[PDB]
């Protein structure tokens, strides 16, 4: 199973590192996308014409007691983003349930619209089962996730403080 990392800053101050395990045995295509977005290895987005890379990306949406969402690398606000395959891809698995905090899952714009955007649950969110593909889990940095969850937000649930991925990649064992 792949491991990836985010080094998070909050208003340019390091908050620490979040490490994910990717369930590549369950949703390999979903996992490969996220993996490559962390490394930036696939280069330029096809429609977006911007790096397929989470580096400098924002957690643009935060909802206390629900989840924290980021990965919109091209717009920083939910409108943008693109998968490593060109555009979006198909929902691959509903096997992993949204039954805990700290699950990594694909944000989307309805059926079969998986791009670069992701969310980290902060409570059990079982109503998202069948609508979003769970593909990973936080293994360390849970306290950083809580710190993000607790940001004061604006009218669109966008943090007033910039919550930015300063560095990212894959942990090669």
Residue numbers in the entry: 7 to 179
Passage from the reporting paper:
Cyclophilins are peptidyl-prolyl isomerases (PPIases: EC 5.2.1.8) and are characterized by their ability to catalyze the interconversion of cis and trans isomers of proline. In order to understand the molecular basis of these results, we sought structural coverage of the entire human cyclophilin enzymatic class. We determined crystal structures of seven human PPIase domains—PPIC, PPIE, PPIG, PPWD1, PPIL2, NKTR, and SDCCAG-10. All cyclophilins share a common fold architecture consisting of eight antiparallel β sheets and two α-helices that pack against the sheets. The active site of the cyclophilin family includes the invariant catalytic arginine (Arg55) and a highly conserved mixture of hydrophobic, aromatic, and polar residues including Phe60, Met61, Gln63, Ala101, Phe113, Trp121, Leu122, and His126.
